[PDB]
């Protein structure tokens, strides 16, 4: 409710509006699936049974292209969607970098800290943005003309941490303001490896957290939202664990089948 808090939210919302292409209208020219070592491969195959999604492309003319991924059959089919994934992620990351760049509090930080914060939070901010386009009724991420639907297996999906995350976060029915404050809290994480200005970052995170807690107190009636702020903070902690897990998966795949774009190589420490 303070004027300062109102200004903080305004800057965040302004940044989000300027850097989040919610219709993905500028995502184009992307790739599409074509029309001891053994120990590594065995793990990699397991790392890709969890990266399955069917893809739908709706043309302007009203036509529809639908892609169903292959079942794990042995080799060089499990990597069919990686190039597309690399393009989507890179597109998302650029939007996340732009988001951080327009934030005054972020710009004042040393260049090295800006880099460290972005490397640490790129996956997280991406998933928070993806949650806003996630349709929990259909289990689909609606990305403009593109749609990614999960392919059901024989609560089952709730087993995949990232999938459970999306349903749980969506169920909270957060406002744009709460999503953007979540992004800020995740971005300004003082405990990211390589941060030098730990003090300043920790102080910034606290101010964003206080703002979020206050926003909830002011805008949400009462009993049902009593612990909303703590539920959000718990979800952010979970996302951080999911980030570390996915990063490990990425490196393993990259090791056997390089596919990361140059920007991804920088963000996740790939030589």
């Amino acid at each position: 409710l303070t004027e300062e808090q109102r200004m903080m939210i305004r800057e965040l919302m302004d940044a989000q509006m300027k850097t989040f292409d919610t219709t993905f209208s500028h995502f184009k020219n992307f790739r599409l699936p074509g029309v001891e070592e053994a120990a590594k491969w065995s793990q990699v195959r397991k790392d890709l049974c969890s990266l399955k999604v069917s893809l739908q492309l709706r043309g302007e003319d009203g036509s529809v292209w639908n892609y169903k991924p292959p079942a794990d059959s042995g080799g060089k089919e499990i990597f069919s969607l990686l190039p597309h994934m690399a393009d989507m992620s890179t597109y998302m990351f650029k939007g996340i970098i732009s988001f951080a760049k327009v934030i005054s509090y972020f710009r004042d930080l040393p260049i090295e800290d800006q880099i460290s914060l972005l490397k640490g939070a790129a996956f997280e901010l991406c998933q928070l943005r993806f949650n806003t386009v996630f349709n929990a009724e259909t289990g689909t991420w609606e990305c403009g003309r593109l749609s990614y639907c999960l392919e059901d297996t024989a609560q089952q999906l709730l087993l995949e941490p990232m999938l459970k995350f999306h349903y749980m976060l969506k169920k909270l029915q957060l406002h744009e303001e709460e999503y953007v404050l979540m992004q800020a809290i995740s971005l300004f994480s003082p405990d990211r490896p390589g941060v030098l200005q730990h003090r300043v970052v920790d102080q910034l995170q606290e101010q964003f957290a206080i703002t979020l807690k206050s926003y909830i107190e002011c805008n949400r009636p009462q009993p049902a939202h009593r612990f909303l702020f703590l539920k959000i903070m718990a979800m952010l902690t979970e996302l951080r664990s999911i980030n570390a897990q996915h990063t490990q998966r990425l490196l393993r795949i990259q090791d056997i089948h390089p596919f990361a774009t140059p920007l991804m190589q920088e963000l996740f420490g790939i030589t």
């Binding site: 760049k101 260049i111 460290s116 490397k119 920007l263 920088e266 963000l267």
Partner: peptide, 15 residues
Amino acid sequence: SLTERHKILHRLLQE
């Protein structure tokens, strides 16, 4: 050294 190992990110941050 960090900027050196992140030229693209560095370039994107300066525009």
